[PDB]
Amino acid sequence: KYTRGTVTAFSPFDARADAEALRKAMKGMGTDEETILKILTSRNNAQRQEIASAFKTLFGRDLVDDLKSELTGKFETLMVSLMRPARIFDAHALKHAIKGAGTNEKVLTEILASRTPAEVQNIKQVYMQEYEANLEDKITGETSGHFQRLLVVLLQANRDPDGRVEEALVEKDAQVLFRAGELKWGTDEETFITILGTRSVSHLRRVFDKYMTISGFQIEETIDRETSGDLEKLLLAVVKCIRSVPAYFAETLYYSMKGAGTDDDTLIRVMVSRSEIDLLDIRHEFRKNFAKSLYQMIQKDTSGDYRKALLLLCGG
Ligand SMILES: [Ca+2]
Ligand SMILES: [Ca+2]
Ligand SMILES: [Ca+2]
């Protein structure tokens, strides 16, 4: 319950020697895409931030700008995502899932359902600092309904603390989800939003066990994934992050490749975001749950340099 990542600090690290090798790779006609990917997937984000700085000191050019202008396609996206400061990554993804016409409900849900209260608290903050707006005013302007109210509950980064579990309560709560389950998460929404958004994790895992003993089914079993509802999808992402974040992302990754095509926007966002948190645990849930390794699914769904950088990120 000690999460491991797939990317560690490279050594021996020489930011100046790394910046000089990237310049050369990009300098002139064409590009050496392979020196680029070898450096970027074997340096962690802090290190990358230090290569960016060195690069700006030595040539008076911007590394990202240069990647952007030299690279192309998904390889470009991947590399540019690797380069984004970890501190801003989430705030940035949220600015774009929201900005423009429509909304990307998907990023909304993934990030709010999966990040820790501390991580939500940091995001709200970097967002205010960088974009100048209040995260909350925005979500609230793009979404509506119970969907909207559950994201706001989640944005308070206020779930109860893991202490004493009172079984009576565990018991009261199970009886109400049981009932809403039967109702197709159709009503008394206000009540199950209160329960799922605010109770501690230890208290809700207990609730789900209890729930299973009343009904004979697991709470997620009472909601179709593939089909609709934005709130349903958000309820589902919460339930699963409550039991295991790594399992939730393994499954997220699996559905980004199963069937014709790939949701490359999700493949990349996840691979990058969790590369230094729980990407190894995720690879483990994927294999136990999917019967395939992340590596082989990715080998098969992607191609080229985009594919080799992803496989280096992945690790085995
Ligand atoms: Ca060039
Ligand atoms: Ca929008
Ligand atoms: Ca596919």
Swiss-Prot record:
Annexin repeats lie at residues 13-84, 85-156, 168-240, 244-315. GO terms for cellular component: calcium channel complex; cytoplasm; sarcolemma; vesicle; vesicle membrane. Pfam families: Annexin. SMART domains: ANX. Keywords: Annexin, Calcium, Calcium/phospholipid-binding, Repeat. InterPro entries: Annexin, Annexin_repeat, Annexin_repeat_CS, Annexin_sf, ANX5. Coiled coil: none annotated. GO terms for molecular function: calcium channel activity; calcium ion binding; calcium-dependent phospholipid binding; phosphatidylserine binding. One of its GO terms (biological process) is negative regulation of coagulation. A pair of annexin repeats may form one binding site for calcium and phospholipid. PANTHER family: ANNEXIN, ANNEXIN A5. Collagen-binding protein. Belongs to the annexin family. This is Annexin A5. The gene is ANXA5.
